[PDB]
Design a protein around this ligand. Structure first.
Ligand SMILES: O=C(O)c1sc(-c2ccc(Cl)cc2)cc1NS(=O)(=O)c1ccc(-c2ccccc2)cc1
Ligand SMILES: [Cl-]
Lengths: 237, 233
């Protein structure tokens, strides 16, 4: 095919072990998540993959995933572009709560609604939230407009702010012939896959990308996949 | 009162910093990595904040920057890589230790290369074990035939570093962005010579320490207001 695109979702994070909602909280990879990224990078290396430009988020679990991959494929010299628009979904007032605290505060009915809904956001992250200043006041978002900095996101919102970066910055590079690697998060990559494959809301909500695994798209010149996404790695994985 | 921070990477693998590593893409040794950690330590203790980072395309510098960014919790910063910040290209000497250099070319010629600002070493020829490894490396594929060196005098090195400084770094400094630069001995020499208006002899005598933040305070014309200061204990 004309073009080749590779995606990778970061592995386990420090708060995954605590089953706390991270969202825009900047949790690091756990040691296992780091090893996952090493194995994904080794897979890209064994297949001889070469890239020309990399995109990631401003969250260190994704950036460290990208770094680990670039180390394993000996392409640390590649240009790297970071953007908030590839960040994980913003989980609003749920940020920092674990599974038990979430169920305790909101009830399983409300939680089920948030789980299966495409466009209903979680509560907003208010100024008295324990991570409000940690996230909303982080200088890395200093240049965001008031309507750009979310207090909370539905999956719809997440995709709606990821896809402008895709269209305006990634698509031109792919059509320039550059081999792109995107290292990001479950829900931002969902936005990209939903656009690539023309998936429905239900279908994208049922899609769970595996972690630490290179995802390969073969694309024609209009960036339509010519075959299903392919996972790279040993036969087991 | 702009703030500019430079950091020179530390020790590379296989003693290659005592072997004219130049454009060979040697990785840091564990000790050189530890050095970068200590420098990042120092910067975080001091509460330094950056807005943009510049480095070479060589992994010992890149990994140094990565280690600093990790230590100061600023991995989200934008990073620009450029070959123009590469270490000096030592041509045919690349990879040889001091004894092998003397044995191959003689003490008199080696002293001349050591002390001269504008006499390059001999070119890296196809028989050199690094010739195809460096000259056919994909990251240089866009360089014009005049741009890809086979060897560099110190003069050459500074001459290709300065256009990047003037065209890319200066405008960021003038916008008030706090710049971090992680690079190599001789490209950083280029920056320092331009900053302090040093002479050729002076720049050849200056030996920047490794793994230590080097802090510059510049006025509205990018002229240092005081000597460079080092960050540590
Ligand atoms: O079970 C399920 O898959 C989901 S998804 C979901 C949900 C999705 C979107 C919104 Cl906005 C709100 C909620 C709720 C549940 N149920 S849960 O028991 O309360 C639960 C709560 C947290 C976790 C967790 C585990 C690791 C790291 C971080 C969090 C797992 C489960
Ligand atoms: Cl980077």
């Amino acid at each position: 095919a004309a073009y080749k695109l590779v995606l990778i979702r970061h592995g386990e994070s420090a708060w995954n072990l605590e089953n706390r909602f991270s969202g825009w909280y900047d949790a690091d990879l756990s040691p296992a998540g780091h090893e996952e990224a090493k194995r994904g990078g080794q897979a890209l290396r064994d297949a001889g993959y070469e890239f020309d430009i990399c995109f990631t988020s401003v969250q260190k679990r994704a950036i460290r995933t990208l770094w680990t991959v670039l180390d394993a494929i000996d392409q640390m010299w590649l240009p790297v572009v970071r953007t908030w628009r590839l960040n994980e979904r913003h989980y609003g007032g749920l940020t920092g709560l674990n599974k038990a605290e979430t169920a305790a505060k909101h009830g399983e009915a409300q939680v089920k609604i948030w789980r299966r809904s495409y466009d209903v956001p979680p509560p907003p992250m208010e100024p008295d939230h324990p991570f409000y200043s940690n996230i909303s006041k982080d200088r890395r978002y200093a240049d965001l407009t008031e309507d750009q900095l979310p207090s909370c996101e539905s999956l719809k919102d997440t995709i709606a702010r990821a896809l402008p970066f895709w269209n305006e910055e990634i698509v031109p590079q792919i059509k320039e012939g550059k081999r792109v690697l995107i290292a990001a998060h479950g829900n931002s990559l969902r936005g990209i896959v939903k656009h690539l494959e023309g998936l429905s809301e239900e279908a994208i909500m049922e899609l769970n990308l595996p972690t630490g695994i290179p995802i390969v798209y073969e694309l024609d010149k209009n960036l339509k996949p010519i075959k299903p996404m392919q996972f790279l790695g040993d036969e087991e994985t």
